[PDB]
Every structure is written in structure tokens, then in C-alpha cells.
């Protein structure tokens, strides 16, 4: 079984450089072409280049001329993508991908590497309750949630009652605020008759800052 293991997510300040690695295994490295593809959040796919694993030559997308350097290490079966003079526009998930058919199109992808380019510093979120009430009821159904404010960079995950609660859960995509910090909400609709009986805790995980917040949402 073919595997492509990429290096972890990176936070970079504008003007800095990043080097992403892609470790290949489970197949003969020189058999399949290696490609680098990026996607800015909410945008399309952008082909960066194709690396020949044997001769080490890269065919580049000219948009990345003098900015991107794509290499391969035969001894470690690892591909690298280096991107210099990083700007806000370079915030994207960077993927390495191979073509298991032997041709120039690709089919097997690495997990991706989020590279966030910003002046903002890594910060864990503030977690505030969105308490249920009568203004949050709808005929035996009540809504409640957690407001996950002022964090950097993406991503955050939200679970309810350690994963025991999944029905009626809506975790909204984050919004980037003018402060350069992210904010999101996670809601859930439950029977309004469970409000006195059932405990509701949102479990907020922000791996980039090593933050884990458990917030009980009490009724009003």
C-alpha cells in the first residue's frame, strides 16, 4: 500500500520561507511522477509543478518562477517543495500527489500541509456559551451552542459531550476577523425537555496552540 506522509502545518510571517516535505513509501519511488498542488481556503486547485523522481528535474508552473523550488531526495524517497517571499496570497493547503498509472495526471494524494501566511501570532480560542432559552425554542426543540472566538491559525474542531452528541450539530466554517484572528460557532438543537436533565459540553480543540477547552452550556 502506497503512502505519502507530509510534514506538519506551518505559520509564516509575510516575507518568510517554508519547506514542505512529502515522504513516499510502499512503492518504487522512481515509478510515479510527483506533483505539488495547492488550494487557498474557499478557492480552486492550482498545479505548482511535477518532479521527475529519477533525474530530479522539475517542470514548473511559471507563476511560481524564482519563488518555488521542488526537489527529491532519492536516498529518503522524499519530495520537497520550498516557497520563498511568502505573502498573504500563499495561505493554502499544499499537497503532494502521485500518478500510480505512470502518466502525468495524479490520483494518490498526501494529507496536505496548511501553510498560514499572516502577521498574527498563534493564539488559543476563548469559548463562550450560547445558552438555550425561550428565544431559542421551537415546539419542543431548543438550540444551544458555543462561540469559539479569537484564535489563530486554523483549524479548530468542536465535539459535543465527548462525541456522544452528533445529531442536530452544526459547526460553522470559521470567519477571519479584521484583527487577523479566527472566530466560529458550533450549535446543536435538542429536546427543550432535556434542558434540566441533560448536561451539554462543547469540547473545543485547537491543536496549533495546544489548547483544549471544555465548556458546559447551562440553560437560562
Amino acid at each position: 500500500q502506497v503512502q505519502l506522509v507530509q510534514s506538519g502545518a506551518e505559520v509564516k510571517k509575510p516575507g518568510a520561507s517554508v519547506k514542505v516535505s512529502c515522504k513516499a513509501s510502499g512503492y518504487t519511488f522512481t515509478d510515479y511522477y510527483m506533483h505539488w498542488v495547492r488550494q487557498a481556503p474557499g478557492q480552486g486547485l492550482e498545479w505548482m509543478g511535477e518532479t521527475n523522481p529519477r533525474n530530479g528535474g522539475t517542470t514548473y508552473n511559471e507563476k511560481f518562477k524564482g519563488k518555488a523550488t521542488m526537489t527529491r531526495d532519492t536516498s529518503t524517497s522524499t519530495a520537497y517543495m520550498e516557497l520563498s517571499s511568502l505573502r498573504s496570497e500563499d495561505t493554502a493547503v499544499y499537497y503532494c500527489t502521485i500518478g500510480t498509472s505512470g502518466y502525468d495526471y495524479f490520483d494518490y494524494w498526501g494529507q496536505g500541509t496548511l501553510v498560514t501566511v499572516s502577521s498574527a501570532s498563534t493564539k488559543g480560542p476563548s469559548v463562550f456559551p450560547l445558552a438555550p432559552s425561550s428565544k431559542s425554542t421551537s415546539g419542543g426543540t431548543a438550540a444551544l451552542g458555543c462561540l469559539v472566538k479569537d484564535y489563530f491559525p486554523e483549524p479548530v474542531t468542536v465535539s459535543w459531550n465527548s462525541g456522544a452528541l452528533t445529531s442536530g450539530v452544526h459547526t460553522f466554517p470559521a470567519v477571519l476577523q479584521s484583527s487577523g484572528l479566527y472566530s466560529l460557532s458550533s450549535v446543536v438543537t435538542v429536546p427543550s425537555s432535556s434542558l434540566g436533565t441533560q448536561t451539554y459540553i462543547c469540547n473545543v480543540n485547537h491543536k496549533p496552540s495546544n489548547t483544549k477547552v471544555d465548556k458546559k452550556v447551562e440553560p437560562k
Binding site: 492550482e46 502525468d104 498526501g110 496536505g112 463562550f128 456559551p129 452544526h170 472566530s183
Partner: protein, 218 residues
């Protein structure tokens, strides 16, 4: 170099009904070997793209026979004979015939379902947040169809502008509905200076707009 353009940009199809997505290359895409390396990928949110069709018309391993590809010259079509709920995401055409290899801008396939009005809920800021000097007021529009919706914030009947941000979830996997979260951000001092907080919701499922409100400190 070779620009890939897709038609339509998005479409909503009833499960069981056909879907057709076109791709156009700005110039011919015949590789030196005589093959046309036109591929179709499907990308689901939070996932990497999955190869469906390669060389215009060949299905990749594990791809259901409801997906088919056709085309010649500069015009290519991906067809789904009968759409399934699992087919949702962004479809991309891609050419690996002439360097630099290029993708189309994507086609979002959505599920068409019946109109459903949203359930509207308003949340005042928490007392814990107020202690830090900021007040976030949240308006929730739950389980509606179609996506098109308007949220308007009013603070003591005065229309708010430039102090709110909204977010929409992807179509629900069970009911094919959308949900929308709108957050009104004010300072504690500004929030305490006012009483009435309302969000007015405009949607196709509602005969007239629905207003959800609260009075500060009640």
C-alpha cells in the same frame, strides 16, 4: 497557458436525476503521444480530490458506472446518469497534455430538495464575554432550503452595517438543508447603551420576513 473553463459553476440536482458538467480548453489538449489527458476529479469539503475519469472517457478503479466522460477537440463532458447524495462536492476538470498542467475553476454539485423555511434563534452575549469588554450577539437560521437568505441586524430599531459577519454550513448529509450563523460584534460599553436586539430573516420558505429579538437584561 491552457485555460480550463467549466459550465455550469454550480447546479442542484434531485437524487435519481441526471447531471451534466462541461469543460472547455482554450486551445487543443492533444498530448505528443496522441492522447488527450483530460481528467475529472471530485473534491468533497475537508478532503483531497478523488480521480473519477482519465483520458476523457475512462473510469478510474472503484468509480461507479453512473459516471461517464466524453469529448473531442476543446469540449469535454462529465455525466452522472442518476445523481446520488454521495456525489456532492466540487467537480474539476484537469488537463495533463500541455505544460503547465491546468485545472478548471470547479463545478459544485448540490442536492435539490423541497423549500424549507429556517427556524430562527437569537443569543445575547454571555456574561463571561461581557467581563472581557466585547459583546457578540448571535443569530442562528437553522435547517433551510435553498441557501439564499438575508439577515439584518437592528439595535433599538437602527439598522447595523459593517459590524457583522456570517457563515453557512455545507448541505446537511441527512436532510440536504443549510444553516447560517450571523454574529453582531459590539463593545461591552456600546452593548450596554442599548436595549432591543433583533435579527430579521428573509427567505423563500417564509411568506413574510421573521424577526427574532430580545431586550438586554431580561
Amino acid at each position: 497557458d491552457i485555460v480550463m473553463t467549466q459550465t455550469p459553476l454550480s447546479l442542484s440536482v434531485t437524487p435519481g436525476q441526471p447531471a451534466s458538467i462541461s469543460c472547455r480548453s482554450s486551445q487543443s489538449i492533444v498530448h505528443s503521444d496522441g492522447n488527450i489527458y483530460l481528467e475529472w476529479y471530485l473534491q468533497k469539503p475537508g478532503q483531497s480530490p478523488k480521480l473519477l475519469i482519465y483520458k476523457v472517457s475512462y473510469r478510474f478503479s472503484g468509480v461507479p458506472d453512473r459516471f461517464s466522460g466524453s469529448g473531442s477537440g476543446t469540449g469535454f463532458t462529465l455525466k452522472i446518469s442518476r445523481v446520488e447524495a454521495e456525489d456532492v462536492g466540487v467537480y474539476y476538470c484537469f488537463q495533463a497534455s500541455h505544460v503547465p498542467y491546468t485545472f478548471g475553476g470547479g463545478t459544485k454539485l448540490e442536492i435539490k430538495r423541497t423549500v424549507a423555511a429556517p427556524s430562527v434563534f437569537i443569543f445575547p452575549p454571555s456574561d463571561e464575554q461581557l467581563k472581557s469588554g466585547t459583546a457578540s450577539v448571535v443569530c442562528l437560521l437553522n435547517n433551510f432550503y435553498p441557501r439564499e437568505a438575508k439577515v439584518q441586524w437592528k439595535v433599538d430599531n437602527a439598522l447595523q452595517s459593517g459590524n457583522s459577519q456570517e457563515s453557512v454550513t455545507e448541505q446537511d448529509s441527512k436532510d440536504s438543508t443549510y444553516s447560517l450563523s450571523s454574529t453582531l460584534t459590539l463593545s461591552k460599553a456600546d452593548y450596554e447603551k442599548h436595549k432591543v436586539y433583533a435579527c430579521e430573516v428573509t427567505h423563500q420558505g417564509l411568506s413574510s420576513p421573521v424577526t427574532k429579538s430580545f431586550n438586554r437584561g431580561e
